Amino acid sequence: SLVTELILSADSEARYPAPKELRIFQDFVKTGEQRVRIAKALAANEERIVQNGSQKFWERCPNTPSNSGVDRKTASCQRDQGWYVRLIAYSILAGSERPLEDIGTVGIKEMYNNLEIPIRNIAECMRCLKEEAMAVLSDEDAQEVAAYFDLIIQSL
Amino acid sequence: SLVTELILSADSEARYPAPKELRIFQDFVKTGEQRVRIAKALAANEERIVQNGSQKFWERCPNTPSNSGVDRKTASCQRDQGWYVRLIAYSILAGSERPLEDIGTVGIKEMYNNLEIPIRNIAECMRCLKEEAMAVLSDEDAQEVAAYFDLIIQSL
Amino acid sequence: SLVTELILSADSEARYPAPKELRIFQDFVKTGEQRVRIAKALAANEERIVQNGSQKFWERCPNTPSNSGVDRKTASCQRDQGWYVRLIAYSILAGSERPLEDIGTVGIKEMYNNLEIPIRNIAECMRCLKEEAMAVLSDEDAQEVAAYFDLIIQSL
Amino acid sequence: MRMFRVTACVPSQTRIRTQRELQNTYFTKLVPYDNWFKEQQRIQKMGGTIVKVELATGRRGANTGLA
Amino acid sequence: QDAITTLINTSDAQGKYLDDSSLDTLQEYFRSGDLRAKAAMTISANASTIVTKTVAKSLLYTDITGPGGNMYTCRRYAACIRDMDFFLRYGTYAMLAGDASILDERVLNGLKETYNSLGVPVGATIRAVQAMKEVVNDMLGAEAGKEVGYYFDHICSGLS
Amino acid sequence: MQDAITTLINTSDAQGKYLDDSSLDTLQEYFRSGDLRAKAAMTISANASTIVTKTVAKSLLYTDITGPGGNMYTCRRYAACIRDMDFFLRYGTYAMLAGDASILDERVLNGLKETYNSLGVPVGATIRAVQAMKEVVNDMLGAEAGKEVGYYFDHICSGLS
Amino acid sequence: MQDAITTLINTSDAQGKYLDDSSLDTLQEYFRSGDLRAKAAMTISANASTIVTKTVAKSLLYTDITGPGGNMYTCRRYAACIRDMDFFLRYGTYAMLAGDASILDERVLNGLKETYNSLGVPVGATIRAVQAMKEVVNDMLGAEAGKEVGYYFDHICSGLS
Amino acid sequence: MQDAITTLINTSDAQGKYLDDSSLDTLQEYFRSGDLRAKAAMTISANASTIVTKTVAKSLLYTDITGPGGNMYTCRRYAACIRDMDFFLRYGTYAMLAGDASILDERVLNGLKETYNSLGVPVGATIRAVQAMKEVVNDMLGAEAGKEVGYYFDHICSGLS
Amino acid sequence: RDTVTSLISNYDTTGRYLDRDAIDSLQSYFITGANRVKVAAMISANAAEISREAGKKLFEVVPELIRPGGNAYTTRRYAACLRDMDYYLRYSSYALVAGNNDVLMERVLQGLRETYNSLGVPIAPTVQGIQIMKEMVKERASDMGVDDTSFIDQPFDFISREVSEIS
Amino acid sequence: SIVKQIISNADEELRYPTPGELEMIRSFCKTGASQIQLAKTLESHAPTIVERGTRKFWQICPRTPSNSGSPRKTEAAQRDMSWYIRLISYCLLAGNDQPLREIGLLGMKELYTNIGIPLDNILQYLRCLKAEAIALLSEAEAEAIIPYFDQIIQELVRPGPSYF
Amino acid sequence: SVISQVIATADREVRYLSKGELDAINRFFNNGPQRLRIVSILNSNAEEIVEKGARRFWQRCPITPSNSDNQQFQASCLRDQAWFIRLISYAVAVGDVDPLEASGVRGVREMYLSLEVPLRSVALCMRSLKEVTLAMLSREDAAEVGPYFDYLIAGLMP
Numbered sequence A, B, C: 001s002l003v004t005e006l007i008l009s010a011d012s013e014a015r016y017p018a019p020k021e022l023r024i025f026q027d028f029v030k031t032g033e034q035r036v037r038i039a040k041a042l043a044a045n046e047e048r049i050v051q052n053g054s055q056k057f058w059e060r061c062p063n064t065p066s067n068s069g070v071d072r073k074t075a076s077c078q079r080d081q082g083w084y085v086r087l088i089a090y091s092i093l094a095g096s097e098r099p100l101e102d103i104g105t106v107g108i109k110e111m112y113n114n115l116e117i118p119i120r121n122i123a124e125c126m127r128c129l130k131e132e133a134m135a136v137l138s139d140e141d142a143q144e145v146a147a148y149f150d151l152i153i154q155s156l
Numbered sequence D: 001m002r003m004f005r006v007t008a009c010v011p012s013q014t015r016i017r018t019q020r021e022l023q024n025t026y027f028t029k030l031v032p033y034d035n036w037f038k039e040q041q042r043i044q045k046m047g048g049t050i051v052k053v054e055l056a057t058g059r060r061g062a063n064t065g066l067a
Numbered sequence E: 001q002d003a004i005t006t007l008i009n010t011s012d013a014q015g016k017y018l019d020d021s022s023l024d025t026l027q028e029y030f031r032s033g034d035l036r037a038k039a040a041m042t043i044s045a046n047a048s049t050i051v052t053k054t055v056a057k058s059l060l061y062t063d064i065t066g067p068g069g070n071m072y073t074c075r076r077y078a079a080c081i082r083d084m085d086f087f088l089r090y091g092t093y094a095m096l097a098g099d100a101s102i103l104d105e106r107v108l109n110g111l112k113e114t115y116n117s118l119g120v121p122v123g124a125t126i127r128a129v130q131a132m133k134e135v136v137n138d139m140l141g142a143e144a145g146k147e148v149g150y151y152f153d154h155i156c157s158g159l160s
Numbered sequence F, G, H: 001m002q003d004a005i006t007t008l009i010n011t012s013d014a015q016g017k018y019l020d021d022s023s024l025d026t027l028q029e030y031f032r033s034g035d036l037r038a039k040a041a042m043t044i045s046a047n048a049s050t051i052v053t054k055t056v057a058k059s060l061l062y063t064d065i066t067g068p069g070g071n072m073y074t075c076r077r078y079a080a081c082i083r084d085m086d087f088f089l090r091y092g093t094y095a096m097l098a099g100d101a102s103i104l105d106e107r108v109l110n111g112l113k114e115t116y117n118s119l120g121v122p123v124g125a126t127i128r129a130v131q132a133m134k135e136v137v138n139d140m141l142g143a144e145a146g147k148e149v150g151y152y153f154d155h156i157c158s159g160l161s
Numbered sequence I: 001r002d003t004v005t006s007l008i009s010n011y012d013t014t015g016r017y018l019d020r021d022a023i024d025s026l027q028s029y030f031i032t033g034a035n036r037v038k039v040a041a042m043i044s045a046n047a048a049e050i051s052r053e054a055g056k057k058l059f060e061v062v063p064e065l066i067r068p069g070g071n072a073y074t075t076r077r078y079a080a081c082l083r084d085m086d087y088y089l090r091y092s093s094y095a096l097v098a099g100n101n102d103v104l105m106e107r108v109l110q111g112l113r114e115t116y117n118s119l120g121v122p123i124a125p126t127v128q129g130i131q132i133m134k135e136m137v138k139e140r141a142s143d144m145g146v147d148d149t150s151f152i153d154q155p156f157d158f159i160s161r162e163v164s165e166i167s
Numbered sequence J: 001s002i003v004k005q006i007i008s009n010a011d012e013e014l015r016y017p018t019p020g021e022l023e024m025i026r027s028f029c030k031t032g033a034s035q036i037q038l039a040k041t042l043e044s045h046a047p048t049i050v051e052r053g054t055r056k057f058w059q060i061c062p063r064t065p066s067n068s069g070s071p072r073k074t075e076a077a078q079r080d081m082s083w084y085i086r087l088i089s090y091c092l093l094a095g096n097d098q099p100l101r102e103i104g105l106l107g108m109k110e111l112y113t114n115i116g117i118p119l120d121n122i123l124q125y126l127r128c129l130k131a132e133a134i135a136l137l138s139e140a141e142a143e144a145i146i147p148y149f150d151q152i153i154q155e156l157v158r159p160g161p162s163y164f
Numbered sequence K: 001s002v003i004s005q006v007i008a009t010a011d012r013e014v015r016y017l018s019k020g021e022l023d024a025i026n027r028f029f030n031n032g033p034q035r036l037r038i039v040s041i042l043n044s045n046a047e048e049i050v051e052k053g054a055r056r057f058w059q060r061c062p063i064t065p066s067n068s069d070n071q072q073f074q075a076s077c078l079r080d081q082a083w084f085i086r087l088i089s090y091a092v093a094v095g096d097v098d099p100l101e102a103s104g105v106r107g108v109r110e111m112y113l114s115l116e117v118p119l120r121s122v123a124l125c126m127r128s129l130k131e132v133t134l135a136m137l138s139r140e141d142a143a144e145v146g147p148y149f150d151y152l153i154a155g156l157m158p
């Protein structure tokens, strides 16, 4: 989160929060209302976000384990899409991508290679979910969400 | 500057700047006009700031080399005060104390201890200059300037 | 002490104390009687040394917390002076400033800044104690005690 | 950051230390999490008996905030 | 870990989103953020002064300070005020974060063992921490002083 | 470490004794197992990633140790478990090819239990998954070399219990 | 590293005065370009792997640089070229987000020509690859941000020159 | 480390006064034993290898702790024991010259017993070795200086027991 | 890189498969390998004698090196020179096993002249002693029964050629 | 052993053993029966080599701690030499020189200088044992075990092999 | 090769090539000619190995860039098959994977990630290439060659 990172940056040179750190903290606390609005919107519409993203991702990339005829694989893909958008909600709530990084996007390649899932297919799907997140959000909301969606993109 | 440390933090872990750091960059970029106004204010009333600060500094402490009757020492004290408020203006403009640190507070004690000048005398003169900047600036500008003033006070 | 530092220099390179180090040993041992005479001399007249040091230091630097009217602060300053001349006698006994450094000149500046007494005031007071030790001690004796006095000058 | 409190004694089997190269082997050391795997592997490579590994800093099952 | 991070951890353990009670907790933190930032400015403004007053009011002119005591010698006085500055800065960090997890991760762990190993007296140490709580309560007021003094009591219990 | 030859040499050398007939025949058994032990080590070296994939699929997936609150949740922990498995399989390959399990004793089981108890990593799920790995290598290597690497998988399972 | 604000402050500090009016005008220019600077850095951060892939595809694949005896033969050297292009792109993005090429001079250009001549790395083909990277980055951000970062790519080419 | 003078200063410093007559009398004792302590150090430094030779001969050789399976078997461990013996002798020399066993308590006895129990070094065997080394220093130094060095060798043994 | 890996790397860098000239050269190296291993064995059995006696012969023919002006006068420098002799003999034996001078290229000639110019070590007594080592290994190889002394000729000549100056 | 060195080198780089390492292992296992028979010849003939070497070395060098009147020094000399041939047989069975180095070359000179045995007399005694082992066993079986005798010999001729 | 690494091992723990290492390289020199003859057979069969392996690879993996309608991708893939066969013959000639490791295992994953070519698909193609080569070779020839195929596959099996 932004607070923990600001403290550990103050901790590193063994000092108090500098003239910028308190300013970033005030920015975070005053944008908190907007962040809570984003989180509420995402938690409300995650179901249709996942459905529309899977629709666009299967219209775009169909050579996937997500649509290889096994319903367990498809249900797992939908659950993973919902989990990742929930992690993006955690990121916008925390003010930093560290809920996304420490849970979703650090061991991502080794894990999804171990699952034998093609990495670029997941990248395509995260791009689909990012586009639908634009489709439901306002301009600042969708910009702040697309931030962490492209974090997921970079991790793949 | 603050953006220098943003780029150096993106460096040394071999990564691109996170959108959280990009958000710090946006916020600094919109506070830039206020910071330019504050620096113009300091470059405007620096003369009276040094005059009144030296006045109150000699009022609270007459046992300094700056008022020992040698006017070259008083000229050097005036010039040190003016240089430091110039550095604080640089810090405001850069959005970080690192110009102020790397020009006037890294080897601060070695220089002033070579100059046979008491450290806490410079610190108390800096407190006087801080109170003068408090007296002449608006409240948010006063907080921003007095924070870097306090940074110098910590360096002593 | 000199003995400890001889042992440490013979250590950290895993060697025996060289013949020259044991020459140092057997000579510092023959230096012993004059060191006991100095410790006894400094212990015998310590009260008058601190009285006359306070006299000259209050004559030369009156802007001190010792002569602010509080006899508790005055008594504490006399206690500090007696403690420091005790440490210098200890350093004669040991043959080096290791007791002096370890007990009184390692965290000297940080402590007296926590106690808010100006550092140069302590330097002037110890210079007064130094010149009274010149007054009360013979020439070789004045040299051996003024050495650790100059060490106290360096720390302040 | 979450730390490991590790006590181990790592012996030398490939070199004779003459008089100064001898340092110590029984060390108790705070180890960062991101290096403890490599330190465990290194002191297993040199042949050390690891007698005590505990979590000095941080809690178990931390999904986030552990560093 | 901070208040937001603990909330995320709890809802990730339970696997769901942040419910309305956790959103109330988060709105509490987010509306306390401004006054916590002001108190952080104030503690960064006069930290050395606070340490000066607390060593004067709690640790000086007892025989702990004089010979045979633990703050005797210049280096041990420097180490003691260093530890006092540590406690002040880390209580400030915990006030900024809203949780004492930073104290439980960096300050309190190992500290009792190390203080008992060096012969540092824990009782006078906890006295110094609550005297710091009193001085910050005096120079900031009731509310912000209450928030930071709660974490000072957390440190006081961790030494205890 | 010790291999089969080094444990035989060590057992004889800690007695001031040349290797005897029982030791010479045990070393003969090692020499005549060497060819299939090398072939099994090469097969595992080829198929290590597939082994770990199938092992985690059949023992550790679609259980609550994977979902939220599970120990294999939060992808870096899944990757940590997969790294643990690559190390388990490579050290089992070392033990099976060397003929002795001492490489396991001095590079896995020393420290592994206390690290897992320090981190809250469940040892029972680790052991069940490691024997599932043993079953996988049994499945696609054969009965003989599969059991030969399964002996050292049993040693990894026993040393964690 | 001296960014635009830092080098501006350095000029005025060497001159000894405050930042003059024209220096404040340039700082205003930087402060109103910073939003598109952050957005361009955001897109480069997202699509860095794609940018390097299409750049190598348009300037370094299907030439004799990738055939035997070419410098991009022997897969480790292809990977070394990929990681050099990644260094070029990320450090040019740092320079664009900073508003001055000091990070390119200090972290990249200060001895890369010596190292590339020492290793026998093609300087001219790296310059062509960096210009192709400038074309690729130009293509998916648009004219303004594209030239704003292509200035730093051209600076990389000039320092390799 | 601390020497006899340093400890006298340290107790007098913790009490808060100059050295009283008893502390100065202990100083007289130390300063008048300094000549023989220096001579004993010269003798120990000159004959270190010989002292370790006779010490290992009269306590450690010809018994099954040097046999197969023993601790000084497998030549590198015997040379490790030689190094430990020479280290103990040199640190006993440092302790004898300083007049204090503080250096041993800081650099020798701090964690040595736990270390040896972790390596499997027989603690009783090296304690018997240190007493034999005490006997060798007794024989080739005399009763007086031999007893003096034997005090710090006893401190080594007690910190090892 | 031995002969095998050097030739393979050359054909890799030009992209060709193995032609019959390479197969003949590889088979030739594999046939000479028995003699190469025999010389490595004799070297590992008599290395101290060969290196030290070559140093002795060099100091007899070049007398000045043990004289006070020379850079092998004291026993510290004498032992350093004999250790250098052991270095040359060991890496020349490595090259004899490999059949290639890559080991010498990266581990003997990687700055030897810079070191010997920094310390004042004379180059030409070093290569003279290298040649004495080569003649010694040649003669006990001929006594051992190896008719082909061509293989053992090459590493010492390579070290001499790369180290010596241009007259 | 060969497998020991291969496992150590493979675990250093955190990689599985390569096909060439496994070819090395299979070739060594193919020669394993032969090397076991080499060790068998060594086991059968070792005390004869020890007794003839100790007689020859005493004749060539009387100033020897074993040749001093004490029976225990004599028994210790035979014990040490038989132990060295035991390590040579271990080297035959392991496939490399690990059980000579690790179990008695590493730290051997300093061991004996602490003991008080002169190492030049040790060198001569080993030369004698090498001679009687050359003359005692066979021709082809000498080529396998006498090089390890040379390996233990080569560690102590090095203060400087003497010339004019 | 075994001889380079045994030289490096003797260099690290400073000594000469001891007798066991000498027997190891003696067995290497004795096994040389068989490696040479099987290298000659691989050079004779390399083209047909590529054709049959590509046919079996497309049978076992039709959704690939090689099997797309773009013939540049197919030509690059067939060139890759020939290059890996040449490198495998290099590895067979050397007796270890040092040409293979030096040229086509180290960094091959990073390249094919930079080319976006699926490394599982390359691993499957090398599996089919292994099957074709083992079919085209005798049982002991298969015993020599198949490990190098296994090591090429495992270098990208991730």
Ligand SMILES: *[C@H](C)[C@H]1/C(=C/c2[nH]c(/C=C3N=C(/C=C4\NC(=O)C(CC)=C4C)C(C)=C\3CCC(=O)O)c(CCC(=O)O)c2C)NC(=O)[C@@H]1C
Residues within 6 Å of the ligand: C064, C065, C066, C067, C072, C073, C074, C076, C077, C078, C080, C081, C083, C084, C103, C104, C115, C117, C121, C122, C125, E056, E060, E061, E065, E066, E071, E072, E073, E074, E077
């Ligand atoms: C006198 C030369 C100067 C001066 C002194 C002054 N000191 C105090 C209070 C204290 N002084 C000490 C110092 C030490 N304790 C140690 O262990 C060491 C090493 C030997 C030192 C130097 C301490 C600990 C105190 C605290 C209280 C006490 O008595 O222990 C005061 C009073 C401070 C106050 O106002 O509360 C004063 C005035 N003042 C001068 O003007 C001189 C330059």
Ligand SMILES: *[C@H](C)[C@H]1/C(=C/c2[nH]c(/C=C3N=C(/C=C4\NC(=O)C(CC)=C4C)C(C)=C\3CCC(=O)O)c(CCC(=O)O)c2C)NC(=O)[C@@H]1C
Residues within 6 Å of the ligand: E064, E070, E071, E076, E077, E079, E080, E081, E083, E084, E086, E106, E107, E111, E114, E118, E120, E121, E124, E125, E128
């Ligand atoms: C002062 C209020 C009390 C006191 C203090 C005292 N402390 C030490 C030594 C140490 N203090 C610590 C504590 C910390 N180190 C850290 O990094 C952190 C930050 C999270 C803490 C809290 C440690 C570890 C030490 C030992 C190492 C060091 O020197 O820092 C001393 C010195 C003791 C000695 O003999 O060296 C003292 C005097 N003493 C009192 O009497 C007060 C009650």
Ligand SMILES: *[C@H](C)[C@H]1/C(=C/c2[nH]c(/C=C3N=C(/C=C4\NC(=O)C(CC)=C4C)C(C)=C\3CCC(=O)O)c(CCC(=O)O)c2C)NC(=O)[C@@H]1C
Residues within 6 Å of the ligand: A064, A065, A066, A067, A072, A073, A074, A076, A077, A078, A080, A081, A083, A084, A103, A104, A115, A117, A121, A122, A123, A125, F060, F061, F062, F063, F066, F067, F072, F073, F074, F075, F078
């Ligand atoms: C969907 C966008 C893509 C896809 C999905 C897919 N995933 C799996 C299996 C798993 N996915 C996960 C995921 C996570 N665990 C975590 O901790 C995190 C962060 C919160 C994530 C994202 C896990 C653990 C599994 C394993 C199964 C399980 O949950 O027990 C599958 C199944 C693969 C199979 O064959 O079993 C699938 C299909 N597939 C696609 O094609 C999309 C690109």
Ligand SMILES: *[C@H](C)[C@H]1/C(=C/c2[nH]c(/C=C3N=C(/C=C4\NC(=O)C(CC)=C4C)C(C)=C\3CCC(=O)O)c(CCC(=O)O)c2C)NC(=O)[C@@H]1C
Residues within 6 Å of the ligand: D033, D034, D036, D037, D040, D041, D060, D061, D062, F065, F071, F072, F077, F078, F080, F081, F082, F083, F084, F085, F087, F088, F091, F107, F108, F111, F112, F115, F119, F121, F122, F125, F126, F129
């Ligand atoms: C996988 C089968 C199970 C599992 C794994 C898991 N492990 C960790 C963390 C660590 N595991 C180790 C492992 C080892 N230490 C050694 O010496 C050896 C070599 C043979 C091994 C395998 C280490 C060192 C760590 C800590 C350091 C690091 O993670 O790099 C975790 C993460 C725990 C956490 O809190 O993050 C996990 C998840 N978990 C399961 O549920 C499986 C049954």
Ligand SMILES: *[C@H](C)[C@H]1/C(=C/c2[nH]c(/C=C3N=C(/C=C4\NC(=O)C(CC)=C4C)C(C)=C\3CCC(=O)O)c(CCC(=O)O)c2C)NC(=O)[C@@H]1C
Residues within 6 Å of the ligand: D010, D011, D012, D017, D022, D023, D024, D025, D026, H060, H065, H071, H072, H077, H078, H080, H081, H082, H084, H085, H087, H107, H108, H109, H110, H111, H112, H115, H119, H120, H121, H122, H125, H126, H127, H129
């Ligand atoms: C000899 C008298 C006895 C003996 C010795 C023995 N020691 C070791 C190994 C080590 N000894 C040390 C010792 C020290 N390190 C230090 O820093 C200091 C001061 C605290 C000492 C005294 C260490 C650290 C080691 C391990 C690493 C090293 O050898 O340098 C061994 C080897 C045991 C093993 O390999 O496991 C032996 C044999 N053994 C006896 O039986 C004698 C009575």
Ligand SMILES: *[C@H](C)[C@H]1/C(=C/c2[nH]c(/C=C3N=C(/C=C4\NC(=O)C(CC)=C4C)C(C)=C\3CCC(=O)O)c(CCC(=O)O)c2C)NC(=O)[C@@H]1C
Residues within 6 Å of the ligand: G057, G060, G061, G062, G063, G066, G067, G072, G073, G074, G075, G078, K064, K065, K066, K067, K072, K073, K074, K076, K077, K078, K079, K080, K081, K083, K084, K087, K103, K104, K115, K117, K118, K121, K122, K125
């Ligand atoms: C075929 C099995 C798979 C496949 C292949 C494919 N490869 C490319 C492009 C290249 N492949 C290489 C290969 C190598 N470089 C080396 O140094 C070595 C080792 C010695 C090898 C094998 C290179 C250099 C290229 C770049 C093009 C060139 O030759 O300059 C492509 C084309 C990708 C593109 O976008 O052009 C393809 C398709 N395709 C499959 O379907 C198989 C899995």
Ligand SMILES: CCC1=C(C)/C(=C/C2=NC(=C\c3[nH]c(/C=C4\NC(=O)C(C)=C4CC)c(C)c3CCC(=O)O)/C(CCC(=O)O)=C2C)NC1=O
Residues within 6 Å of the ligand: H057, H061, H062, H063, H066, H067, H072, H073, H074, H075, H078, J064, J065, J066, J072, J073, J074, J076, J077, J080, J081, J083, J103, J104, J111, J115, J116, J117, J118, J121, J122, J123, J125
């Ligand atoms: C296997 C590694 C090893 C070796 C070689 C070893 C050496 C050893 N031999 C020992 C001793 C001797 N070696 C010898 C041997 C020789 N006497 C000679 O003059 C020659 C040429 C030799 C060849 C080694 C003698 C006479 C002794 C008498 C012991 C003494 O003088 O102290 C001992 C004494 C302890 C004991 O026997 O139990 C030791 C520790 N012990 C080991 O751990």
Ligand SMILES: CCC1=C(C)/C(=C/C2=NC(=C\c3[nH]c(/C=C4\NC(=O)C(C)=C4CC)c(C)c3CCC(=O)O)/C(CCC(=O)O)=C2C)NC1=O
Residues within 6 Å of the ligand: I056, I059, I066, I073, I074, I075, I076, I078, J162, J163, J164
């Ligand atoms: C401390 C000064 C010093 C000395 C004395 C020294 C010794 C030394 N003498 C040496 C050699 C000899 N000393 C001697 C002779 C003696 N050396 C003596 O002191 C005595 C009394 C003798 C026995 C008679 C012999 C015969 C050699 C043979 C040299 C050779 O092997 O060719 C050498 C070798 C180099 C050379 O030949 O010049 C060295 C390094 N090196 C040094 O640094």
